[PDB]
């Protein structure tokens, strides 16, 4: 009687229309996944690789 | 001793600190005005070592079973005196301070200790295989010392973890109380025959004793003593 809750699976606002051009989707394309994930994975994998190579290189102590 | 060797009697020869023999030669040479070589040592170091050591030989008339000690200055195994001794031995046993500081009083480094008769024709096939495996383990451990030091035990693979655990158990198990060590250690002395040692290490390498904590391998005899101590601890 006092509140309404919508446990919806997916909620979209096509009314915005520019949402794509908007960062919501435009950044989601570049500001997200591209650097939010792909760049994260590249950097972290490169760090692990440099670590493993130098830990082989230090295998004489 | 050469008189007794020449008449056929077997001789047990125990020389103490062959180094001290070399250091004195060094002091004598320094007082004699000879041109010093390397770290103040005599120029005639190799020749003096040869003249002393080639007399310590078993001949066709008699045999001399010689056991020597050598003192390494500081902890430098590259010192000219031990480096000269190394080529005059059938069996080398290297005691390391790092092992000794771990309360491993035998203090022998298995990877830096060799012997010529460690040959399957001479010592036996099982003894040879056990010794080679006990070196391959602890060689895998020496190869992974830094990874364990920095990253830790978790990063190693499962078989690498097993080999490292077995290597540390082997390091603890090489420790052994001595009958002459009762003065400062309360552990009674233990005499482990070579057959018992080989059997114990073969059982340890097979997997028996994996469940046993490493602390139960410290100051023990054969594997049966370790098992009895584990059962006493339940």
Curated annotation (Swiss-Prot), chain A:
Q: Does the keyword Chaperone apply?
A: no
One GO cellular component from the entry? Answer: plasma membrane
Organism superkingdom: Bacteria
Q: Where is this region: Disordered?
A: 19-40
Cite a single GO MF annotation. Answer: proton-transporting ATP synthase activity, rotational mechanism
The compartments listed are: Cell membrane
For whether the record's keyword set contains Transport, the answer is: yes
Q: Which UniProt keywords apply?
A: ATP synthesis, Cell membrane, CF(1), Hydrogen ion transport, Ion transport, Membrane, Transport
Its BP terms in the Gene Ontology are: proton motive force-driven ATP synthesis
Quaternary structure? Answer: F-type ATPases have 2 components, CF(1) - the catalytic core - and CF(0) - the membrane proton channel. CF(1) has five subunits: alpha(3), beta(3), gamma(1), delta(1), epsilon(1). CF(0) has three main subunits: a, b and c.
Q: Hey, which family's this protein in?
A: Belongs to the ATPase epsilon chain family.
* Its job: Produces ATP from ADP in the presence of a proton gradient across the membrane.
Q: What is this protein called?
A: ATP synthase epsilon chain
Swiss-Prot record, chain B:
Source organism superkingdom: Bacteria
Which compartment or compartments is the protein found in?
Cell membrane
User: According to its UniProt record, which protein family does this protein belong to?
Assistant: Belongs to the ATPase alpha/beta chains family.
Q: What does this protein do?
A: Produces ATP from ADP in the presence of a proton gradient across the membrane. The catalytic sites are hosted primarily by the beta subunits.
Subunit and partners? F-type ATPases have 2 components, CF(1) - the catalytic core - and CF(0) - the membrane proton channel. CF(1) has five subunits: alpha(3), beta(3), gamma(1), delta(1), epsilon(1). CF(0) has four main subunits: a(1), b(1), b'(1) and c(9-12).
- What is this protein's record name? ATP synthase subunit beta
Organism encoding this protein:
Chloroflexus aurantiacus (strain ATCC 29366 / DSM 635 / J-10-fl)
- Quote the gene name from the UniProt entry: atpD
Span within the parent record: 237 to 470 of 471
């Amino acid at each position: 009687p006092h509140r309404v809750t919508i446990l919806a699976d997916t909620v979209e606002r096509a009314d915005e229309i520019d949402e794509a051009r908007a960062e919501q989707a435009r950044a989601e394309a570049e500001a997200r996944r591209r650097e939010a994930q792909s760049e994260r994975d590249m950097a972290l994998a490169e760090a692990k690789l440099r670590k493993e190579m130098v830990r082989l290189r230090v295998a004489q102590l | 001793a050469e008189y007794f060797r020449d008449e056929g009697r077997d001789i047990l020869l125990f020389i103490d600190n062959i180094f001290r023999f070399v250091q004195a030669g060094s002091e004598v040479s320094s007082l004699l005005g000879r041109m010093p070589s390397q770290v103040g040592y005599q120029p005639t170091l190799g020749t003096e070592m040869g003249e002393l050591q080639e007399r310590i030989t078993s001949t066709k008339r008699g045999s001399i079973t010689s056991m020597q000690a050598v003192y390494v200055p500081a902890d430098d195994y590259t010192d000219p005196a031990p480096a000269t001794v190394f080529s005059h031995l059938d069996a080398t046993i290297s005691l390391e301070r790092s092992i000794a500081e771990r309360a491993i009083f035998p203090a022998v480094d298995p990877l830096a200790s060799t012997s010529r008769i460690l040959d399957p024709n001479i010592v036996g096939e099982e003894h040879y295989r056990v010794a080679q495996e006990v070196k391959r383990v602890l060689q895998r451990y020496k190869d992974l010392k830094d990874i364990i030091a920095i990253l830790g035990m978790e990063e190693l693979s499962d078989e690498d973890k097993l080999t490292v655990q077995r290597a540390r158990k082997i390091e603890l198990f090489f420790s052994q109380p001595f009958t002459v060590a009762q003065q400062f250690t309360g552990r009674p002395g233990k005499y482990v025959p070579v057959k018992k040692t080989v059997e114990s290490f073969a059982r340890l390498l097979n997997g028996e004793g994996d469940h046993i904590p490493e602390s139960f391998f410290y100051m023990q005899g054969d594997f049966d003593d370790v098992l009895a101590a584990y059962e006493a601890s339940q």
